[PDB]
Design a protein around this nucleic acid. Structure first.
Ligand SMILES: [Cu+2]
Ligand code: NA
Length: 327
DNA sequence: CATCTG
DNA sequence: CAGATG
Protein backbone atom coordinates (compact mmCIF):
# COMPACT_ATOMS: atom_id res chain seq x y z
CA UNK A 1 0.00 0.00 0.00
CA UNK A 2 2.97 2.34 0.42
CA UNK A 3 6.08 0.31 1.06
CA UNK A 4 6.16 -1.03 -2.62
CA UNK A 5 4.46 1.79 -4.47
CA UNK A 6 7.39 2.99 -6.68
CA UNK A 7 7.06 -0.40 -8.30
CA UNK A 8 3.34 -0.99 -8.06
CA UNK A 9 3.45 2.33 -9.75
CA UNK A 10 6.01 1.65 -12.45
CA UNK A 11 4.34 -1.53 -13.68
CA UNK A 12 1.05 0.11 -13.82
CA UNK A 13 2.43 2.74 -16.27
CA UNK A 14 3.77 -0.12 -18.24
CA UNK A 15 0.50 -1.96 -18.44
CA UNK A 16 -1.40 1.05 -19.67
CA UNK A 17 0.98 1.78 -22.40
CA UNK A 18 1.06 -1.86 -23.47
CA UNK A 19 -2.76 -1.82 -23.45
CA UNK A 20 -3.09 1.53 -25.12
CA UNK A 21 0.02 2.22 -27.12
CA UNK A 22 0.50 -1.30 -28.26
CA UNK A 23 -2.39 -3.59 -28.51
CA UNK A 24 -0.44 -5.88 -26.16
CA UNK A 25 -3.18 -7.40 -23.90
CA UNK A 26 -1.04 -10.27 -23.10
CA UNK A 27 1.79 -8.06 -21.91
CA UNK A 28 -0.71 -5.71 -20.46
CA UNK A 29 -2.31 -8.29 -18.25
CA UNK A 30 1.17 -9.43 -17.29
CA UNK A 31 2.05 -6.10 -15.59
CA UNK A 32 -1.39 -6.07 -14.25
CA UNK A 33 -1.33 -9.08 -11.99
CA UNK A 34 2.37 -8.66 -11.26
CA UNK A 35 1.92 -5.19 -9.72
CA UNK A 36 -1.17 -5.93 -7.63
CA UNK A 37 0.54 -9.02 -6.47
CA UNK A 38 3.64 -7.14 -5.47
CA UNK A 39 0.99 -4.93 -4.28
CA UNK A 40 -0.33 -7.49 -1.81
CA UNK A 41 3.31 -8.22 -0.68
CA UNK A 42 3.92 -7.55 3.01
CA UNK A 43 7.51 -6.49 2.71
CA UNK A 44 9.69 -3.98 1.05
CA UNK A 45 11.29 -5.39 -2.10
CA UNK A 46 15.06 -4.63 -2.51
CA UNK A 47 15.95 -7.05 -5.31
CA UNK A 48 14.39 -8.29 -8.44
CA UNK A 49 14.83 -11.82 -7.36
CA UNK A 50 12.96 -11.16 -4.21
CA UNK A 51 9.92 -10.52 -6.28
CA UNK A 52 10.62 -13.06 -8.91
CA UNK A 53 9.93 -15.46 -6.19
CA UNK A 54 6.48 -14.22 -6.72
CA UNK A 55 3.79 -15.38 -8.89
CA UNK A 56 3.48 -13.31 -11.97
CA UNK A 57 6.88 -11.89 -11.53
CA UNK A 58 8.94 -13.12 -14.38
CA UNK A 59 12.48 -12.47 -15.28
CA UNK A 60 11.50 -9.65 -17.57
CA UNK A 61 9.67 -7.64 -15.03
CA UNK A 62 12.32 -8.71 -12.50
CA UNK A 63 14.94 -7.00 -14.43
CA UNK A 64 12.66 -4.00 -14.79
CA UNK A 65 12.25 -3.87 -11.05
CA UNK A 66 15.96 -3.93 -10.50
CA UNK A 67 16.52 -1.02 -12.86
CA UNK A 68 14.10 0.80 -10.68
CA UNK A 69 15.82 -0.29 -7.53
CA UNK A 70 19.23 0.45 -8.99
CA UNK A 71 18.30 3.91 -10.26
CA UNK A 72 15.41 6.24 -9.52
CA UNK A 73 14.01 5.34 -12.98
CA UNK A 74 13.11 3.08 -15.88
CA UNK A 75 14.58 4.16 -19.22
CA UNK A 76 11.97 2.41 -21.30
CA UNK A 77 9.60 4.46 -19.22
CA UNK A 78 11.27 7.90 -19.69
CA UNK A 79 11.51 6.95 -23.32
CA UNK A 80 7.72 6.19 -23.36
CA UNK A 81 6.92 9.50 -21.54
CA UNK A 82 8.63 11.48 -24.27
CA UNK A 83 7.52 9.75 -27.47
CA UNK A 84 5.08 11.90 -29.39
CA UNK A 85 3.15 9.04 -30.92
CA UNK A 86 2.47 7.34 -27.70
CA UNK A 87 1.68 10.68 -26.06
CA UNK A 88 -0.38 11.64 -28.96
CA UNK A 89 -2.16 8.32 -28.48
CA UNK A 90 -2.88 8.85 -24.83
CA UNK A 91 -3.96 12.39 -25.48
CA UNK A 92 -6.39 11.28 -28.22
CA UNK A 93 -8.03 8.65 -26.16
CA UNK A 94 -9.30 11.38 -23.85
CA UNK A 95 -11.93 11.95 -26.39
CA UNK A 96 -15.25 10.10 -26.02
CA UNK A 97 -15.63 7.46 -28.79
CA UNK A 98 -11.96 7.56 -29.69
CA UNK A 99 -10.20 4.62 -28.13
CA UNK A 100 -6.88 2.87 -28.49
CA UNK A 101 -7.71 1.50 -31.87
CA UNK A 102 -8.96 4.82 -33.16
CA UNK A 103 -6.06 6.71 -31.61
CA UNK A 104 -3.51 4.65 -33.38
CA UNK A 105 -5.35 4.98 -36.58
CA UNK A 106 -5.90 8.68 -36.24
CA UNK A 107 -2.36 8.94 -35.09
CA UNK A 108 -1.28 7.21 -38.20
CA UNK A 109 -3.10 9.61 -40.29
CA UNK A 110 -1.29 12.57 -38.55
CA UNK A 111 -4.19 13.86 -36.37
CA UNK A 112 -2.84 13.98 -32.71
CA UNK A 113 -4.27 17.04 -30.95
CA UNK A 114 -7.71 18.60 -30.23
CA UNK A 115 -6.70 20.78 -33.13
CA UNK A 116 -6.34 18.03 -35.66
CA UNK A 117 -9.66 16.37 -34.85
CA UNK A 118 -11.61 19.55 -35.64
CA UNK A 119 -10.02 19.86 -39.03
CA UNK A 120 -10.59 16.20 -39.63
CA UNK A 121 -14.02 16.03 -38.25
CA UNK A 122 -15.56 14.45 -41.43
CA UNK A 123 -13.76 11.29 -40.29
CA UNK A 124 -15.10 11.18 -36.76
CA UNK A 125 -18.37 9.61 -35.89
CA UNK A 126 -21.34 11.17 -34.07
CA UNK A 127 -20.08 9.97 -30.78
CA UNK A 128 -16.72 11.04 -31.74
CA UNK A 129 -18.05 14.26 -32.88
CA UNK A 130 -20.05 14.80 -29.77
CA UNK A 131 -17.07 13.63 -27.81
CA UNK A 132 -14.78 16.30 -29.31
CA UNK A 133 -17.49 18.95 -28.93
CA UNK A 134 -17.80 18.59 -25.23
CA UNK A 135 -14.09 17.61 -24.64
CA UNK A 136 -14.08 20.09 -21.75
CA UNK A 137 -17.53 19.54 -20.13
CA UNK A 138 -17.05 15.87 -20.25
CA UNK A 139 -13.77 16.33 -18.46
CA UNK A 140 -15.43 18.24 -15.58
CA UNK A 141 -17.53 16.79 -12.67
CA UNK A 142 -21.03 17.91 -11.94
CA UNK A 143 -21.62 19.70 -8.64
CA UNK A 144 -24.23 17.94 -6.58
CA UNK A 145 -26.01 21.28 -6.55
CA UNK A 146 -26.31 20.51 -10.21
CA UNK A 147 -27.12 16.91 -9.56
CA UNK A 148 -30.00 18.04 -7.52
CA UNK A 149 -31.32 20.26 -10.34
CA UNK A 150 -31.08 17.70 -13.17
CA UNK A 151 -32.68 14.99 -11.16
CA UNK A 152 -35.45 17.32 -10.19
CA UNK A 153 -35.95 17.40 -13.88
CA UNK A 154 -35.55 13.73 -14.64
CA UNK A 155 -38.01 13.00 -11.89
CA UNK A 156 -40.39 15.71 -12.96
CA UNK A 157 -40.86 14.36 -16.42
CA UNK A 158 -40.28 10.58 -15.77
CA UNK A 159 -43.47 11.21 -13.72
CA UNK A 160 -45.41 13.43 -16.03
CA UNK A 161 -44.99 10.71 -18.59
CA UNK A 162 -46.26 7.88 -16.44
CA UNK A 163 -47.12 7.74 -12.83
CA UNK A 164 -45.89 4.01 -12.71
CA UNK A 165 -42.10 4.57 -13.59
CA UNK A 166 -39.47 4.35 -10.92
CA UNK A 167 -36.52 6.61 -11.59
CA UNK A 168 -33.57 6.93 -9.22
CA UNK A 169 -30.16 8.47 -9.86
CA UNK A 170 -27.62 5.93 -8.88
CA UNK A 171 -23.98 6.27 -7.90
CA UNK A 172 -21.90 8.41 -5.50
CA UNK A 173 -24.56 11.12 -5.75
CA UNK A 174 -26.59 8.56 -3.86
CA UNK A 175 -23.85 7.54 -1.46
CA UNK A 176 -23.99 11.25 -0.69
CA UNK A 177 -21.28 12.33 -3.25
CA UNK A 178 -20.72 16.09 -3.64
CA UNK A 179 -19.61 15.41 -7.27
CA UNK A 180 -20.29 12.86 -9.98
CA UNK A 181 -18.98 12.28 -13.51
CA UNK A 182 -22.32 11.81 -15.19
CA UNK A 183 -25.88 11.23 -14.27
CA UNK A 184 -26.64 7.49 -14.42
CA UNK A 185 -30.43 6.65 -13.84
CA UNK A 186 -32.20 3.18 -13.23
CA UNK A 187 -35.64 2.94 -14.78
CA UNK A 188 -38.60 0.73 -13.98
CA UNK A 189 -42.25 0.16 -14.33
CA UNK A 190 -44.51 -2.49 -12.74
CA UNK A 191 -45.42 -3.65 -16.17
CA UNK A 192 -41.62 -4.28 -16.46
CA UNK A 193 -40.16 -7.39 -15.22
CA UNK A 194 -38.42 -10.64 -16.07
CA UNK A 195 -41.05 -12.31 -18.03
CA UNK A 196 -43.01 -9.59 -19.85
CA UNK A 197 -41.83 -9.66 -23.41
CA UNK A 198 -40.11 -6.32 -23.96
CA UNK A 199 -41.83 -2.97 -24.17
CA UNK A 200 -39.07 -0.72 -25.64
CA UNK A 201 -41.64 1.99 -25.50
CA UNK A 202 -41.34 2.69 -21.85
CA UNK A 203 -37.67 3.68 -22.41
CA UNK A 204 -38.17 5.54 -25.64
CA UNK A 205 -41.04 7.20 -23.94
CA UNK A 206 -38.96 8.94 -21.41
CA UNK A 207 -35.82 9.66 -23.38
CA UNK A 208 -38.24 11.40 -25.63
CA UNK A 209 -40.02 13.53 -23.19
CA UNK A 210 -36.85 15.01 -21.78
CA UNK A 211 -35.52 15.59 -25.30
CA UNK A 212 -38.75 17.31 -25.86
CA UNK A 213 -38.27 19.41 -22.85
CA UNK A 214 -34.70 20.39 -23.98
CA UNK A 215 -32.84 18.59 -21.25
CA UNK A 216 -31.40 16.05 -23.58
CA UNK A 217 -29.04 17.79 -26.09
CA UNK A 218 -28.04 14.92 -28.31
CA UNK A 219 -28.22 11.02 -28.29
CA UNK A 220 -24.99 9.06 -27.98
CA UNK A 221 -26.70 5.72 -28.73
CA UNK A 222 -30.10 4.47 -27.85
CA UNK A 223 -31.32 0.94 -27.51
CA UNK A 224 -34.21 -1.13 -26.24
CA UNK A 225 -32.77 -0.93 -22.75
CA UNK A 226 -29.68 1.28 -22.36
CA UNK A 227 -29.46 4.93 -23.44
CA UNK A 228 -26.32 6.97 -23.77
CA UNK A 229 -26.85 10.65 -24.46
CA UNK A 230 -25.74 14.25 -23.87
CA UNK A 231 -27.98 16.70 -21.89
CA UNK A 232 -28.21 20.14 -20.37
CA UNK A 233 -29.54 22.33 -17.57
CA UNK A 234 -31.28 25.23 -19.29
CA UNK A 235 -29.31 28.38 -18.85
CA UNK A 236 -31.49 30.75 -16.71
CA UNK A 237 -30.73 34.42 -17.39
CA UNK A 238 -28.25 34.46 -20.29
CA UNK A 239 -24.78 35.09 -18.98
CA UNK A 240 -24.10 31.61 -17.67
CA UNK A 241 -24.25 28.28 -19.35
CA UNK A 242 -24.36 24.77 -17.89
CA UNK A 243 -21.74 22.28 -18.95
CA UNK A 244 -22.67 19.52 -21.25
CA UNK A 245 -23.24 16.62 -19.24
CA UNK A 246 -23.09 12.96 -19.86
CA UNK A 247 -26.31 11.12 -19.05
CA UNK A 248 -27.21 7.50 -19.20
CA UNK A 249 -30.57 5.86 -18.93
CA UNK A 250 -31.61 2.07 -18.52
CA UNK A 251 -34.88 0.18 -18.50
CA UNK A 252 -34.48 -2.55 -15.85
CA UNK A 253 -37.32 -4.90 -14.79
CA UNK A 254 -39.06 -4.64 -11.52
CA UNK A 255 -37.85 -8.00 -10.41
CA UNK A 256 -34.25 -6.64 -10.46
CA UNK A 257 -34.06 -2.90 -9.96
CA UNK A 258 -32.70 -2.54 -6.49
CA UNK A 259 -30.31 -5.35 -7.11
CA UNK A 260 -28.78 -3.04 -9.60
CA UNK A 261 -30.08 -0.14 -7.57
CA UNK A 262 -27.79 -1.09 -4.60
CA UNK A 263 -25.25 -2.81 -6.81
CA UNK A 264 -24.75 0.34 -8.94
CA UNK A 265 -24.60 2.81 -5.88
CA UNK A 266 -21.64 1.01 -4.35
CA UNK A 267 -19.20 0.96 -3.30
CA UNK A 268 -16.69 -1.11 -5.15
CA UNK A 269 -15.26 -1.75 -1.73
CA UNK A 270 -18.67 -2.12 -0.10
CA UNK A 271 -20.28 -4.35 -2.77
CA UNK A 272 -17.61 -6.91 -2.28
CA UNK A 273 -17.70 -6.59 1.49
CA UNK A 274 -21.35 -7.12 1.56
CA UNK A 275 -20.87 -9.74 -1.33
CA UNK A 276 -18.54 -11.94 0.78
CA UNK A 277 -21.15 -11.86 3.67
CA UNK A 278 -23.83 -12.42 1.10
CA UNK A 279 -22.11 -15.81 0.92
CA UNK A 280 -21.91 -16.34 4.72
CA UNK A 281 -25.76 -16.04 4.97
CA UNK A 282 -26.42 -18.83 2.41
CA UNK A 283 -26.62 -16.32 -0.54
CA UNK A 284 -25.19 -14.71 -3.67
CA UNK A 285 -25.58 -11.40 -5.33
CA UNK A 286 -24.74 -9.89 -8.50
CA UNK A 287 -25.91 -6.63 -10.08
CA UNK A 288 -29.36 -8.43 -10.46
CA UNK A 289 -30.05 -11.15 -7.83
CA UNK A 290 -30.10 -12.32 -4.16
CA UNK A 291 -30.22 -16.08 -4.46
CA UNK A 292 -29.90 -18.87 -1.93
CA UNK A 293 -26.83 -21.15 -2.08
CA UNK A 294 -27.03 -24.92 -2.71
CA UNK A 295 -24.52 -27.04 -0.67
CA UNK A 296 -23.60 -29.66 -3.32
CA UNK A 297 -21.49 -26.81 -4.78
CA UNK A 298 -24.24 -24.50 -5.97
CA UNK A 299 -27.78 -23.96 -7.08
CA UNK A 300 -30.12 -20.98 -6.84
CA UNK A 301 -33.41 -19.15 -7.23
CA UNK A 302 -34.10 -15.44 -6.97
CA UNK A 303 -35.52 -14.60 -3.62
CA UNK A 304 -38.02 -11.81 -4.07
CA UNK A 305 -36.54 -8.27 -3.55
CA UNK A 306 -38.73 -5.10 -2.95
CA UNK A 307 -36.37 -2.83 -0.87
CA UNK A 308 -32.47 -2.45 -0.43
CA UNK A 309 -33.57 -3.24 3.02
CA UNK A 310 -34.88 -6.68 1.88
CA UNK A 311 -31.42 -7.65 0.61
CA UNK A 312 -29.93 -6.68 3.99
CA UNK A 313 -32.08 -8.77 6.29
CA UNK A 314 -31.59 -11.72 3.82
CA UNK A 315 -27.81 -11.63 4.54
CA UNK A 316 -28.47 -10.70 8.20
CA UNK A 317 -27.36 -7.12 7.76
CA UNK A 318 -27.96 -3.66 9.16
CA UNK A 319 -29.85 -1.67 6.57
CA UNK A 320 -27.18 0.74 5.45
CA UNK A 321 -27.64 4.19 4.13
CA UNK A 322 -26.23 4.76 0.64
CA UNK A 323 -23.73 7.13 2.33
CA UNK A 324 -22.21 4.40 4.58
CA UNK A 325 -21.59 2.62 1.32
CA UNK A 326 -17.90 3.71 1.44
CA UNK A 327 -16.68 0.15 2.08
C1' DC B 1 -23.16 -5.93 -21.78
C1' DA B 2 -25.86 -3.37 -25.14
C1' DT B 3 -25.01 -0.51 -29.14
C1' DC B 4 -22.94 1.42 -33.13
C1' DT B 5 -20.03 1.06 -37.24
C1' DG B 6 -18.66 -0.67 -41.86
C1' DC C 1 -21.59 -10.44 -39.08
C1' DA C 2 -16.59 -8.99 -35.97
C1' DG C 3 -14.83 -5.40 -33.41
C1' DA C 4 -15.01 -0.97 -30.99
C1' DT C 5 -16.48 1.74 -27.15
C1' DG C 6 -18.51 3.49 -23.06
CU1 LIG D 1 8.47 -7.54 6.61
NA1 NA E 1 6.20 -14.50 -10.94
Amino acid sequence: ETLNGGITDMLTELANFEKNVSQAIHKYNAYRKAASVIAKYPHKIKSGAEAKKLPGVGTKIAEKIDEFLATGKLRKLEKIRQDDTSSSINFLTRVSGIGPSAARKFVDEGIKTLEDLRKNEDKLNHHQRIGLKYFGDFEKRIPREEMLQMQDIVLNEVKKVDSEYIATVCGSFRRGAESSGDMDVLLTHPSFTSESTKQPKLLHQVVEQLQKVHFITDTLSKGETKFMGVCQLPSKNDEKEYPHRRIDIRLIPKDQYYCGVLYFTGSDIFNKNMRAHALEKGFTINEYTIRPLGVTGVAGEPLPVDSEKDIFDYIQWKYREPKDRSE
